């Protein structure tokens, strides 16, 4: 059991590290998506030809479109893993855990966090890309051939519901921390020190939601139930990769991604 | 939103109804499992199974053995569905929902509640059966052949973790109510009143856990995280039925029975 002032300090700590670790925050993404700004407008990719023009205009070749798009998501997921890893090191207590557990927490936690933060870059019509310089429409992603057409749509379905909770970055900073420090991951050696940290983070999240959304009844509980939707999306994604590996033997995963997905 | 006195009234209402709807409560099952009490008849191998049917006359095992046991779980699950249906009618607001939504909430909720309540009858060594008169060991279940051996064990693994929260019946009565009122079930026509009721139940559950477990920090959050463990087991269970349907044709019964068990 922690004191209110210590919980507020923990929330401020975590929000501060989240800003230092993730260059594209939800606040910035919403300013780009909402508009009313001439300096932040993204180039919109909605079909084959505008994708062609996008590489001319956005920048960061002998491949097929759905593959190039898919490989673009792998590259960005690797960057996201790197940012999530840097953030986790700042969670008080995380780096003091057993080394194998640290790896285990990251292995199972990064994807649930990736889809969480991807919701920030999404609205019902598409997703920001290339650090907010681009915007790729949902419809164009859904029209890609083979198994790649269905790849992004579950993420869009989650994002629409998750975004209806109206969380801001300071909420997400604590929520992401709660996800990483899950004591129910398979193969953890010392569940107890992980659960003590998560108990602190849950208290910080509870107080944060009460203060920042005082008129949003049971938001804490509603937010925890969204961790169920994350688990199912991760499973759905993993099964899709298995289909791609057995069909596209031309294609290859980044070693970091390769390791996360083993088991 | 709601006043503390009304949350305690809501909690008391659900407890009373839960006692009337479920004959074998967690308190009673724990008395039987611990030895804090007619000792229940133990099924631990093939031979004690034969004697159990002869002496107790189980209605779910009245064909090959692993199949009979599988079919026995289906019979009991169908009974549990009716008990859960009657309980849901007492949840304030439920019967005033659109009739199709009531059916949708029960349809998708009963499996999660069956597993939740199955944990009340389980310990790490086996499961109570036949309204507490029998006890089937975990080891005997794990030793059933073909896919039936691996059918039973996920339930025990969940039950062991879930039981470590040490909930009692007055906690579970509200938790069960919260599961039923999930506004994210597919095909719901009017989500708003469902989520309105769930907010009241969640408030009642939160206050219940702080009063009944004041030393158990963030138990509310931890119990909500178990709804992830439930959803994953239900999905896993469904996939196992598909595997039995596609391989075990020794399983088809009387067509009338098949309709009862659909
Ligand atoms: N190992 C394993 C195992 C232990 C128990 C069950 C039960 C059960 C659920 C509630 C109750 C209760 O008293 O409230 C008692 C139960 O068992 C009693 C019993 C009877 C005979 C033999 C062994 C046990 N259901 N079930 C299922 O398989 C199942 C589930 Cl969880 C969900 C949906 C459908 C099914 C089903 F269709 F397939 F049956 C169990 C598996």
Swiss-Prot record, chain B:
Coiled coil: none annotated. PDPK1 activates its transcriptional activity independently of its kinase activity. GO terms for molecular function: alpha-actinin binding; arachidonate binding; chromatin binding; DNA binding; DNA binding domain binding; DNA-binding transcription activator activity, RNA polymerase II-specific; DNA-binding transcription factor activity; DNA-binding transcription factor activity, RNA polymerase II-specific. The keyword Transcription applies. A motif (9aaTAD) lies at residues 255-262. Its main location: nucleus. Induction: (Microbial infection) Expression increases when incubated with M.tuberculosis or its lipoprotein LpqH; induction is TLR2-dependent (at protein level). It is found in: Nucleus; Cytoplasm. Transmembrane segments: none annotated. Highest expression in adipose tissue. Lower in skeletal muscle, spleen, heart and liver. Also detectable in placenta, lung and ovary. GO terms for biological process: BMP signaling pathway; cell differentiation; cell fate commitment; cell maturation; cellular response to hypoxia; cellular response to insulin stimulus; cellular response to low-density lipoprotein particle stimulus; epithelial cell differentiation. Rosiglitazone binds at residues 74-77, 111, 237, 261. There is a cross-link at residue 20 (Glycyl lysine isopeptide (Lys-Gly) (interchain with G-Cter in ubiquitin)). It is linked to Defects in PPARG can lead to type 2 insulin-resistant diabetes and hyptertension. PPARG mutations may be associated with colon cancer. This is Peroxisome proliferator-activated receptor gamma. It comes from Homo sapiens. The lineage of its organism: Eukaryota, Metazoa, Chordata, Craniata, Vertebrata. The chain holds residues 235 to 502 of 505 of the full protein.
């Amino acid at each position: 059991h922690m004191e209110s002032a210590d919980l507020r300090a923990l929330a401020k700590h975590l929000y501060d590290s989240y800003i230092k670790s993730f260059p594209l925050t939800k606040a910035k993404a919403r300013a780009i998506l909402t508009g009313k700004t001439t300096d932040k407008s993204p180039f919109v990719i909605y079909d084959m030809n505008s994708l062609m023009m996008g590489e001319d205009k956005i920048k960061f070749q002998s491949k097929e479109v759905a593959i190039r798009i898919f490989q673009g998501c792998q590259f960005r997921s690797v960057e996201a893993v790197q940012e999530i890893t840097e953030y986790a090191k700042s969670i008080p207590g995380f780096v003091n855990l057993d080394l194998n557990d640290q790896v285990t927490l990251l292995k199972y936690g990064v994807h649930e966090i990736i889809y969480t933060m991807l919701a920030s870059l999404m609205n019902k019509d598409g997703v920001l890309i290339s650090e907010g310089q681009g915007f790729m429409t949902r419809e164009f992603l859904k029209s890609l051939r083979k198994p790649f057409g269905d790849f992004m749509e579950p993420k869009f379905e989650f994002a629409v519901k998750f975004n209806a909770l109206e969380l801001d970055d300071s909420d997400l900073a604590i929520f992401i921390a709660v996800i990483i420090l899950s004591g129910d991951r398979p193969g953890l050696l010392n569940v107890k020190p992980i659960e003590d940290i998560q108990d602190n983070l849950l208290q910080a999240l509870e107080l944060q939601l009460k203060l920042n959304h005082p008129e949003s009844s049971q938001l804490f509980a509603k937010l925890l139930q969204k961790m169920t939707d994350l688990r199912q999306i991760v499973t759905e994604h993993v099964q899709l990769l298995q289909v791609i590996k057995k069909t596209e033997t031309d294609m290859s995963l980044h070693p970091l991604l390769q390791e996360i997905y083993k088991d």
